[PDB]
Amino acid sequence: LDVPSSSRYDHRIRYVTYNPADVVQVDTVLGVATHIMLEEGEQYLTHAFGDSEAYAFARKGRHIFIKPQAELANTNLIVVTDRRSYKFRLQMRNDRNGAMYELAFRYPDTQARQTREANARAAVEAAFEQRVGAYYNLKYMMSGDKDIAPVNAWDDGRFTYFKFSANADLPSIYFVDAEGNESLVPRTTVGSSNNIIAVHKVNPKWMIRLGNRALAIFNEAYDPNGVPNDTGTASPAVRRVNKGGN
Amino acid sequence: LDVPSSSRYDHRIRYVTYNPADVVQVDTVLGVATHIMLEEGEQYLTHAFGDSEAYAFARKGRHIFIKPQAELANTNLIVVTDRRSYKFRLQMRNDRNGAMYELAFRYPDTQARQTREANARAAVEAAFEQRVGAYYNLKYMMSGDKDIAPVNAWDDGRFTYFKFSANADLPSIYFVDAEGNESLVPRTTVGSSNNIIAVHKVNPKWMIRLGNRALAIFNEAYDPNGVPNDTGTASPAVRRVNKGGN
């Protein structure tokens, strides 16, 4: 039977630590309005009194107002929401002293959940950025309209990164087959200043165009073997699991 | 008679295991409303009191709310649901002590049935993956545009597989007749990294096509006899049964 902890400024405002296995005692004096604040995003279902005529009930959303309107009111409340169900043990105060104006709940369960999943993205982001155990190949030739040349090009065995100077206009890249036929390849843009364009394929050829200017890129050490994407993520450290179930 | 055991924090919150061979004892006092929680997703049909007037029953979803309105509230509750029916012995307590603020069920039946189904599915999956009594043929041959050829090819006597280097595009595979015509064949992609393509016929000849480039795969040890598929599924250790009867 948790008694809510008094606010340091005034005992008339009380905080209590929520628990699905305990019932909180509510002290109500004659003629005051008892304020219940629900945590954000609780969808109210319904409640129940020990005496519907003993206490006055008004609710809109996450705010519940309780007020005794009949003498000698010793009943209880069971309020249910989509997430949880709060339980109270109401004792009518006989001396109009030790009044409690408002009750607020602390939810250690939500904190425990969110802190855990916060650590979840912590691990995910760390694994993504760490990218250790990856090799880089730099052997790349070039020919054509040199003015739109990428300042550097390299591949990580999965992608291929092209970079350009801050004054260089970002060109387009087209994936070249063995026969000389150009076809699209999905490009993603990364890098500090959007000076890195990454294409989602490794190919023994590439071609770069802009306006009526062209350029070819050769992979002098195209490794057809590569490393299988054993996890379906750009990293070898991010497992990809099927959430949907069913 | 099952009597629920209270929670360690409050004697009002009691937990109990459902059983169809006995009826829950509920010890209600005057001035309390009892919260009853059905199993998640359970579908209530109807209920029955000894006295419809003795207790009020308000229900929304899976939540049951009761409270005695008359003295000597000594009757029964028989609520029926789609999956089961719950039974209660509402006994009035004249001392207004030892309340029942709630009652939550720990179902053995649903998890007990779940474990069996999970066990059956596990046995099924183990039967598929174990894959014993399999002979393998590797005498495969190619000719043509080698640039998109598979790294490996083999048959288990039933299916023909092709493994492709993780950097290479996945090509389209066609069936070849003894005459020289081409026919679509169903393909399923298996393997850890989706680098193994499986076609559903063991055949002397195969053509692989992509873009403008083609490659013909030749089997040098096509065995017409094969293995009979008498169990109706890819495994020799799984049957297929006609459950529909009729």
Partner: peptide, 15 residues
């Protein structure tokens, strides 16, 4: 009609 009885009957008839 002692007030405790008032409380009891109001409790009973209430929903």
């Amino acid at each position: 009609k002692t007030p405790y009885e008032l409380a009891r009957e109001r409790m009973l008839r209430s929903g």
